[PDB]
Design a protein around this ligand. Structure first.
Ligand SMILES: [Mn+2]
Length: 289
């Protein structure tokens, strides 16, 4: 009862789904050209993934390049409605679960009004992309800044969250990080907002309040109405703490899954689909796929 995913693009297939363009290259034609090629490759990836028993995917934020930039005014929702609807049908037809992660420049709890504004613009593009596919999906973010200290920063997150439009807020999920905001801190936010928490195992291993894997999982499960998503990674040997592994280690992964069930696992390792294949092989063997 576990789905496996990987993030953004598939290197083996050779259809790049995560291409972006420089601000200096912005034009309607170029945005439509790179969006179309990204989306073609995304459809090809989702097809490949279904055949390889990989039923979770993290769609790249580069899918429509520069979509939330102030100078961007391309009507991609109409112009690409065809391919967008087609990809969404394939996802809903085949029970594929979807997440997106806008990354570090979304800082929903910034003290700077213009940073909050641009962060909401980026979140609105993610909700628009998912809406254009006719699917639900989750948009995962970190809590953000710790300016003025942790408690002020948690309350600024909750305040600004409560100003979001529903098509973003209904999809939003928060994840623990390895520097400031722990599982405990995310659970404090969830209790006051209903936001589900994505558990990231490597981050928790680095920054925690003593909770075991199982206890932290059980806590985070209660924040979801549906099956939880978790982010699985490992430490790259020899690197600074928190640097993500270049591939999963099968024995580490086996030790993790033997503890867990009824969760969709997103692999955040640098060899992408190659690790997703190793994980499908383990899960099938353990009758947990
Ligand atoms: Mn993560």
């Amino acid at each position: 009862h576990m789905r496996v995913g990987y993030v953004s693009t598939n290197y083996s297939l050779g259809c790049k789904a995560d291409k972006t363009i420089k601000l200096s290259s912005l034009s309607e034609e170029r945005v439509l050209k790179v969006s179309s090629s990204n989306l073609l490759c995304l459809k090809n990836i989702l097809e490949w993934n279904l055949k390889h028993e990989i039923l979770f995917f993290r769609i790249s934020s580069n899918t429509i390049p520069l979509a939330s930039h102030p100078k961007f005014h391309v009507n991609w929702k109409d112009k690409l409605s065809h391919i967008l609807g087609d990809i969404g049908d394939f996802i809903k037809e085949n029970s594929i679960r979807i997440s997106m992660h806008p990354g570090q420049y979304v800082v929903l709890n910034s003290v700077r009004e213009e940073v909050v504004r641009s962060s909401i613009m980026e979140l609105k593009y993610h909700a628009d992309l998912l809406d254009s596919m006719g699917i639900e999906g989750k948009i995962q973010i970190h809590v953000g800044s710790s300016m003025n200290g942790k408690e002020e920063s948690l309350n600024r997150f909750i305040e600004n969250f409560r100003k979001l439009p529903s098509n973003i807020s209904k999809r939003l999920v928060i994840e623990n990080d390895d520097k400031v905001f722990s599982v405990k801190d995310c659970l404090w936010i969830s209790e006051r907002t209903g936001i589900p928490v994505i558990f990231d195992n490597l981050h928790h291993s680095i920054l925690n309040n003593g909770e075991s894997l199982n206890d932290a999982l059980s806590l985070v499960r209660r924040t979801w109405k549906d099956r939880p998503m978790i982010d699985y990674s490992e430490q790259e040997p020899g690197e600074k703490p928190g640097v993500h592994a270049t591939t999963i280690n099968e024995e580490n992964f086996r030790r993790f899954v033997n503890e867990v069930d009824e969760v969709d696992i997103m692999l955040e390792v640098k060899d992408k689909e190659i690790s997703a294949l190793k994980a499908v092989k383990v899960l099938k063997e353990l009758n947990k796929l």
